[PDB]
Ligand binder design. Structure first.
Ligand code: ZN
Ligand code: ZN
Length: 55
């Protein structure tokens, strides 16, 4: 894992450019490999559903 952040769903490393970090919980995923969003990163910090339940 040369890249400081990798996608747990894939962990390619190149996709790190669009890898989104979850502030609600330590979870990283690509905008096109987990959430509807795609090449364009969504505004605000996206959080996986489990974190939403905490709030
Ligand atoms: Zn991914
Ligand atoms: Zn999360």
């Amino acid at each position: 894992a040369v890249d400081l952040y990798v996608c747990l769903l894939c962990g390619s490393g190149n996709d790190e450019d669009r890898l989104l970090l979850c502030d609600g919980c330590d979870d990283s995923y690509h905008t096109f490999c987990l959430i509807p969003p795609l090449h364009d990163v969504p505004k605000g910090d996206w959080r996986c559903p489990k974190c939403l339940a905490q709030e």
